[PDB]
Structures are given as structure tokens and as C-alpha cells.
Short mmCIF file of C-alpha atoms in Angstrom, two decimals:
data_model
loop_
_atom_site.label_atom_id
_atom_site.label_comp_id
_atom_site.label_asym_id
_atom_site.label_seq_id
_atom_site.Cartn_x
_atom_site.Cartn_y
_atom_site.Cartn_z
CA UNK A 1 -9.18 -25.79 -12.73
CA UNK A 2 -6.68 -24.23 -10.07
CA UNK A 3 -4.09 -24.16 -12.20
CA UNK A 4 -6.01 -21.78 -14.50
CA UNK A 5 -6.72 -19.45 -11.62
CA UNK A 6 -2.44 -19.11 -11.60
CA UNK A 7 -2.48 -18.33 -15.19
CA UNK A 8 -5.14 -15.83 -15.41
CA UNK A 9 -4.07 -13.77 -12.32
CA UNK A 10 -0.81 -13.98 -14.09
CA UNK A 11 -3.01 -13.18 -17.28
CA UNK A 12 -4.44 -10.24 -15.32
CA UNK A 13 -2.64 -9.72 -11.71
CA UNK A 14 0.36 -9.46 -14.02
CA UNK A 15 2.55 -11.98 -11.91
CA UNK A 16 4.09 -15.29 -11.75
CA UNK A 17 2.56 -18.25 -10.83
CA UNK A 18 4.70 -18.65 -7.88
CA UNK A 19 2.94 -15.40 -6.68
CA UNK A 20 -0.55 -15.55 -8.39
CA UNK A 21 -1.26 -19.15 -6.54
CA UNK A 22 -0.30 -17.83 -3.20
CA UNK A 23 -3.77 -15.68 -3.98
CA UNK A 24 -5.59 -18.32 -4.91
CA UNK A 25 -3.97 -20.69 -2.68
CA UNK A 26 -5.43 -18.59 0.10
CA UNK A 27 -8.87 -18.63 -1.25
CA UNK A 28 -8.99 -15.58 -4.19
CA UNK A 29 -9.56 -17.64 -7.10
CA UNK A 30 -11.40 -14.89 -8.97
CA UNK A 31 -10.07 -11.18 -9.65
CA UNK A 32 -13.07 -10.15 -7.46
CA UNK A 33 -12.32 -11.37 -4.36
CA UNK A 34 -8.88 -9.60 -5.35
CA UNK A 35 -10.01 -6.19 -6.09
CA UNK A 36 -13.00 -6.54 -3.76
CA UNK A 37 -10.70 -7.63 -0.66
CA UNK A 38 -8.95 -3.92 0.70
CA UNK A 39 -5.08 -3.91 0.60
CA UNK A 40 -4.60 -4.02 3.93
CA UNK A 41 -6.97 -7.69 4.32
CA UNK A 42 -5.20 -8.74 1.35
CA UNK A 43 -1.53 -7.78 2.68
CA UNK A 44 -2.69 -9.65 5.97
CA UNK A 45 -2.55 -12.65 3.85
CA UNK A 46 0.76 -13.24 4.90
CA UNK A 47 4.06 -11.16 4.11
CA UNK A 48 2.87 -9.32 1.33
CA UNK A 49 4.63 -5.99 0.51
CA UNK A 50 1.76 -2.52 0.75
CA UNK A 51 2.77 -1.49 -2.46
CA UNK A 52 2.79 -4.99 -4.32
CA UNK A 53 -0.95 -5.45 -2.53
CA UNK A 54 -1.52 -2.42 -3.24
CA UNK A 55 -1.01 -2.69 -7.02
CA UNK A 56 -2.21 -6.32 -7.01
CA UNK A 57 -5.77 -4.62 -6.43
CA UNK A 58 -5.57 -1.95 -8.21
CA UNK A 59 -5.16 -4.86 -11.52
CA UNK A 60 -7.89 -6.54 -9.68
CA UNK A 61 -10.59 -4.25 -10.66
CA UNK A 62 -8.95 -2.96 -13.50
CA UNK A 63 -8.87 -6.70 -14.91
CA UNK A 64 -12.50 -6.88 -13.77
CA UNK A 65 -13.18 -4.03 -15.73
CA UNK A 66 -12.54 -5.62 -18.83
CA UNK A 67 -13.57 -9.18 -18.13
CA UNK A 68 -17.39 -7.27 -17.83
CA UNK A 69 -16.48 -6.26 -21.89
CA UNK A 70 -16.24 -10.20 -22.38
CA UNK A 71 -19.08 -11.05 -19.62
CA UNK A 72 -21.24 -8.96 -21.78
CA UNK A 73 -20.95 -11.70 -24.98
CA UNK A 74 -22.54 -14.51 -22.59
CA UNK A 75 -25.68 -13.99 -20.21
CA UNK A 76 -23.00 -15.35 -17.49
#
């Protein structure tokens, strides 16, 4: 569901909702897309600030990191 995608960012991303859907309301529904988009493409997005992209990503992959610990459990 979209509205966990707000959650989990928030979860993850480590911001609101408010904020967190404005990533997945673009199309970045997965911390991937996130930490795989560069700052810069991801502070296109809009009005972002470089900083807050900049740390946005940087949670991106380091969420990642750990979601592989979990994605380890299940084949998926």
C-alpha cells in the first residue's frame, strides 16, 4: 500500500509523512530508487534543500543496508 511507503521512509528516511510521500508521491516508493537516484536528480524533484537530499540518500542506502540483513530471512 502507498501509505506504507510514507511510513517506512519515515521508518527509514527518518521523516514525516508530509515529506516521505512527496518521495513516493514522485515515484520512489522503495529506499532504492532513493539511495540509487544521485542528490542532485533527487533535489530536482522539486524544491528540495542539497543538504536534506543529500542526507535523505545517504539513509537511503544506509536503510538498504539493513533491509538486505532482513532480505536475507526470505529468498525475496
Amino acid at each position: 500500500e502507498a501509505h506504507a511507503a510514507i511510513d517506512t521512509f519515515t521508518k527509514y528516511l527518518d521523516i514525516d509523512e508530509d515529506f516521505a510521500t512527496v518521495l513516493v508521491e514522485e515515484g520512489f516508493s522503495t529506499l532504492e530508487e532513493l539511495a540509487y537516484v544521485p542528490m542532485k536528480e533527487l533535489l530536482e524533484i522539486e524544491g528540495l534543500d542539497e543538504p536534506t537530499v543529500e542526507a535523505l540518500r545517504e539513509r537511503a542506502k544506509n536503510a538498504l543496508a539493513t533491509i538486505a540483513q532482513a532480505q536475507e530471512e526470505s529468498l525475496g
